[PDB]
């Protein structure tokens, strides 16, 4: 093991679209659901893959309030998206928070979350940790 500085540990976010997973909003909405009784969690990562399709989603009840959470000041838009799908919806019979059925994470600007927020552009992805020093980093990055 060659680990000399703490900032040699990278946390990369790879999207599901690079895993040949169908990413149209038609068949990407069946990996998502509502559930009560689970707290949301966030985890910091460092860098990530440039995304192919991203999503911007706000859903509401028939009384007029959003079913997703209010985003904190930490949450920002995803940096690079080739295509952003704007979906406005309404879901009567559904209480709780939004969760992912595959166990994947909703990627934002250096924050991976288990829930979806309001008015923020995310993607679907998973993170991985590795140890890279500078001499090997300059060899692969280009």
């Amino acid at each position, epitope marked *: 093991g060659t680990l000399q500085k703490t900032e040699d540990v990278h946390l990369m976010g790879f999207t599901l679209s690079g895993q040949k997973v169908a990413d149209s909003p038609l068949e990407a*909405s069946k990996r998502w659901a509502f559930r009560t009784g689970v707290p949301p969690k966030n985890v910091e990562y460092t860098e990530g893959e440039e995304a192919k399709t991203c999503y911007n989603i706000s859903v509401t009840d028939p009384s007029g309030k959003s079913l997703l959470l209010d985003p904190p000041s930490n949450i920002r838009d995803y940096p690079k998206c080739k295509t952003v799908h704007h979906i406005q919806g309404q879901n009567p019979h559904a209480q709780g928070i939004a969760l992912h059925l595959w166990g994947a994470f909703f990627l934002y600007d250096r924050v991976a979350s288990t829930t979806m927020y309001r008015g923020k552009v995310f993607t679907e992805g998973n993170i991985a940790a590795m140890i890279v020093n500078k001499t090997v980093h300059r060899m692969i990055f280009s």
Partner: nanobody
Amino acid sequence: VQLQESGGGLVQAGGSLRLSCTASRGTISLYAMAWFRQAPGKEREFVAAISRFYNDFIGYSTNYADSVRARFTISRDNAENTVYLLMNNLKPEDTASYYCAASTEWASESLQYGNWGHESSKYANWGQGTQVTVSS
């Protein structure tokens, strides 16, 4: 097919109303339905629209005009065969005659992302409308 509107009236600025749209001889579970408004001396403009499939997640896909976002909400109840619009925080620029409409041209396939149903040449079966007046 035959639609009617109800629930309009005169309110002050910042008030709220709820309009109902019912069908007598038509089951609304085959149509995508929308609310419009028209001012005297102005053209008939889009307000809101709601789709026809359910999708479990993102249940009914809706769309709103930019002047009425975060204030108006549209909804439907299939068993009661009714489409509601709840309007909150009214301005005197919202004073108009409101109309209910349906289409069968769209509402196929599934989830309609982005500005959809914003036109008026495909909507038919307009009701007589109701007058919403916001003034001090």
